[PDB]
């Protein structure tokens, strides 16, 4: 019973940056991972970044590695996604999900349980 | 291209086997004598084969072996157990070169394996020693080609010489050539001296000094 | 007073080797039916019961078999390469075996085996007979010395066998009135040279290898 | 099947003797050929052994570096050159053949084919 709220989305030009935020309502103590997912119009739901809460272990897809950075603040109960060198391919509805499983595939939504509403990210030419 | 992340803390060995079976698809006939608690830390996402190599490493660490009795896999026992199994991502160095330098730090009860397909290390040890080994991997990872000098110690104790040489690479007691590294092989009572060629040649002589 | 045995076999059945281990050790083994093959064992040294058991494990490991203790009962089972491999027990005389292993491991392939018997100061080498003869010639050259302090040179653009052939050729062409026998061991698998000998002599040979690296 | 020994004798301490052991009959089926010394009031205890196929010598610690076991497969004989001979080395020397691949080489039970003996006396 842990709701998630996303903010930080917006419209930017290529080579730009955005800091996405994901606030957890209850206590993350019953959830091992908190990841970021994105869906693009006519594109399937795909995972981009994931963080093992207990030790702050980050995981990224090759297409986002060295640009994006997944961070957390257990005090403020939020997880961040620092998106840099943004390409127009990065345009999608960004979702943030929590996982109550110890071992998963951090870039596949089936392994997650609570989901957020979303934040539109638009990168232009 | 499925990649998995195994993270456990004092989880049942049977749960780890159920997770391996979920990933790999391979079904295991667990012997009843197979019992205990496992701690896994995945600093890297892993491929199925990479997950299977992890499984074997965990099984080997706790004293269990896999038997393929008529196309059917079976975990059977062999003859501190609050040991951690970590998957560490080596970034700039080829893992194979790294193992010779890291094996001296891993005890007899421990485990150390290479996953070249993922350029990662599977190490089993005590959590406090793993933190020390990752600090060594981090220091090693920087350098290009790890050329070393090996000093077999006759009178001196390797761990005494290692702490002395490393402490002497500081402010109160200076070496004169830093950026060098000392790795202590207790098993053979020898020092593995690393770092830049000029630096490394100085540290060798300092270890000799103690050998009098 | 402590019993010493000498295991010598040439293409003998694996099951016969196990019966011999059971005769020596007194330990009874439940051999899995999938356990099959032919073994060649060469004992250049007599071995104690514990030393014989360490040999047994080495032979097992070489052929892809593992020992399982299922309810106080020992069982040989197959576990996760040239046709006929030889296991040899070599006696190291003046050097502590533990010091020579690192130098010798680069010569032993992935399919091979190399273990130390410090209680007997002997080496257990599983490889093909032609390679064993080579490794034995390296052990002999290593043995007849004082120190085993060595330098490892990972070669970036040069070929290890070219550098080794050149460094030994510089060695053989001439050496000083003083005795400072140096040694070059070439690890092709990893492209590096292991340099051995006195500390002063070594540093010189190290620089000669770096000049050929291109 | 039958082994003949020669080369024994009386020598002073620090001296040397070369013993010979000739084999006739079933030679192909014998892996080892050794030397045993049966002293008077002393147990039969082997001293030197040779693996015929590869000429592998095995020596007991008491004789190692002083005694040398050799062979001539053509002349079908074994040799034991005893050097730096101590008075403790005084015994009736026997030569035995073993038809076994594995064995405790310094224990007579592992040996089948035997010979008469040669007296060695060191004073």
Domain residue ranges of chain D, discontinuous segments joined by +: 1-123
Q: Rounded to whole angstroms, how far apart are CA atoms B75 and D45?
A: 49
CA distances from C67 to B113, C58, C195, D120 (A): 21, 11, 38, 49
Cβ distance B157 to B150 under 8 Å? no
CB contact under 8 Å between B78 and C98, yes or no, is no
Q: Rounded to whole angstroms, how far apart are CA atoms A36 and A106?
A: 9
Which of A91, A74, A69, A92 shows the shortest CA–CA distance to A19? Answer: A69
Torsion angle of C-alpha atoms C191, C194, C195, C197, degrees rounded to 10: -160
Taking each helix axis from N to C end, the angle separating B158-167 and B197-209, rounded to the nearest 10 degrees, works out to: 130
Chain D residues whose beta carbon lies within 8 Å of the beta carbon of residue C9 = 101-102
Chain C residue whose CA is closest to B149: C151
Helix (H), strand (E) counts: chain B: 6, 12
CB contact under 8 Å between A102 and B42, yes or no, is no
Task: Considering only the beta carbons, identify the residue of C66, C151, C156 that sits closest to B65.
Answer: C66
3-state secondary structure of B177: coil
Q: Rounded to whole angstroms, how far apart are CA atoms D37 and B15?
A: 65
Neighbours of chain D (3+ CB pairs under 8 A): C
Which residues on adjacent β-strands are paired with residue D41?
Answer: none
Q: Rounded to whole angstroms, how far apart are CA atoms C15 and C41?
A: 13
User: Is B56's Cβ below 8 Å from some Cβ in C?
Assistant: yes
CA C186 to chain centre: 15
**B-A interface (Cβ pairs under 8 Å ≥ 3):** yes
Stated as kind and residue range, the H or E segment containing D118 is strand D118-122
β-pairing, C86-91 with C38-43? parallel
User: Is B63's Cβ below 8 Å from some Cβ in C?
Assistant: no
**B-C interface (Cβ pairs under 8 Å ≥ 3):** yes
CB contact under 8 Å between C151 and B150, yes or no, is yes
Chain C residue whose CA is closest to B186: C98
Distance from CA of C6 to the nearest CA of D (A): 6
Task: Considering only the beta carbons, identify the residue of C23, C24, C44 that sits closest to D56.
Answer: C44
User: Is C11's Cβ below 8 Å from some Cβ in D?
Assistant: no
Chain C residue whose CA is closest to B65: C68
In chain B, the domains with their CATH numbers are 1-142 (3.30.1370.120), 144-212 (3.30.1370.120)
CB interface of C with D, residues 39-78, below 8 Å: 42-46
Q: Rounded to whole angstroms, how far apart are CA atoms D78 and D67?
A: 13
Q: Rounded to whole angstroms, how far apart are CA atoms D34 and C54?
A: 26
Chain B residues whose beta carbon lies within 8 Å of the beta carbon of residue C156 = 145
Q: How far apart are the first and last CA of chain C?
A: 60
Cβ distance D48 to D35 under 8 Å? yes
CB contact under 8 Å between A104 and B9, yes or no, is no
Chain C residue whose CA is closest to D104: C5
* DSSP string over C80-127: ---SS-EEEEEE--SS-HHHHHHHHGGGS-SSSEEEEETTTTEEEEEE
Phi, psi of B171, rounded to the nearest 5 degrees: -70, -60
Q: Rounded to whole angstroms, how far apart are CA atoms C78 and C32?
A: 8
Stated as kind and residue range, the H or E segment containing B76 is strand B73-77
Count the helix, strand and coil residues of chain C and give each as a percent rounded to the nearest 5: 40, 30, 35
User: Is C5's Cβ below 8 Å from some Cβ in D?
Assistant: yes
Q: Rounded to whole angstroms, how far apart are CA atoms A98 and A80?
A: 13
Q: What angle do CA D82, D85, D86 make, to 5 degrees?
A: 145
The secondary structure of residue C177, as a DSSP letter, is S
Cβ distance B192 to B199 under 8 Å? no
- CA dihedral sign, ordered B42, B43, B45, B49: negative
- CA dihedral sign, ordered C158, C164, C168, C173: negative
Stated as kind and residue range, the H or E segment containing D109 is none
Q: Rounded to whole angstroms, how far apart are CA atoms C149 and B211?
A: 13
Count Cβ–Cβ pairs < 8 Å, chain C vs chain D: 43
CB contact under 8 Å between A103 and B8, yes or no, is yes
**SS3 annotation, chain A:** CCCEEEECCEEEECCCCEEEEEEECCCHHHCCEEEEEEECCCCCCEEEEEEECCCCEEEECCCCCCCCEEEEECCCCEEEEEECCCCHHHCEEEEEEEECCCEECCCCHHHCCEECCCEEEEEEC
Which of B201, B196, B145 shows the shortest CA–CA distance to C154? Answer: B145
CB contact under 8 Å between B6 and A103, yes or no, is yes
CA distances from B39 to B28, B127, C155 (A): 20, 9, 39
Q: Rounded to whole angstroms, how far apart are CA atoms D73 and D50?
A: 12
Chain C residues whose beta carbon lies within 8 Å of the beta carbon of residue D53 = 8, 10
Residues 6+ apart with CB under 8 A from A79: A21, A22, A24, A34, A36, A51, A70, A71, A72, A73, A96
CB interface of D with C, residues 38-97, below 8 Å: 49, 51, 53-54, 56, 58
């Amino acid at each position: 019973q842990v709701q998630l709220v996303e903010s930080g989305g917006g419209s930017v030009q290529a080579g730009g940056s955005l800091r996405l935020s994901c606030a957890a309502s209850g206590n993350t103590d019953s959830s091992y991972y908190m990841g970021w997912f994105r869906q693009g119009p006519g594109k399937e739901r795909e995972g981009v970044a994931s963080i093992y809460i207990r030790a702050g272990i980050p995981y990224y897809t090759d297409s986002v590695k060295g640009r994006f950075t997944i961070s957390q603040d257990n005090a403020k109960n939020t997880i961040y996604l620092q998106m840099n060198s943004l390409k127009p391919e990065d345009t999608a509805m960004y979702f943030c999900a929590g996982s109550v499983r110890t071992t998963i595939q951090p870039f596949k939504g089936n392994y997650y349980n609570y989901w957020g509403r979303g934040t539109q990210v638009t990168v232009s030419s | 291209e499925a990649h998995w992340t195994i993270n456990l803390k004092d989880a049942d060995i049977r749960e780890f086997i159920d997770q391996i079976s979920e990933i790999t698809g391979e079904t295991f006939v667990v012997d009843p004598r197979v019992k205990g608690q496992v701690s896994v830390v995945s600093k890297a996402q892993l491929s199925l084969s990479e997950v299977y190599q992890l499984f074997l490493s965990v099984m080997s660490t706790h004293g269990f072996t896999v038997v393929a009795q008529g196309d059917q896999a079976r975990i059977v026992p062999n003859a501190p157990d609050r040991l951690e199994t970590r998957v560490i991502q080596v970034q700039q160095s080829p893992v194979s070169e790294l193992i010779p330098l890291i094996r001296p730090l891993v005890p007899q009860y421990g485990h150390l394996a290479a996953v070249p397909s993922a350029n990662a290390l599977i190490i089993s040890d005590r959590s406090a020693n793993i933190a020390r080994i990752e600090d060594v991997i981090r220091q090693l990872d920087q350098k290009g080609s790890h050329d070393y000098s090996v000093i077999n110690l006759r009178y001196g104790w390797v761990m005494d010489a290692a702490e002395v040489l490393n402490n002497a690479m500081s402010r109160g007691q200076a070496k004169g050539a830093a950026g060098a590294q000392v790795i202590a092989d207790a098993r053979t009572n020898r020092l593995i001296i690393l770092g830049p060629p000029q630096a490394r040649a100085k540290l060798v002589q300092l270890a000799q000094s103690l050998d009098t």
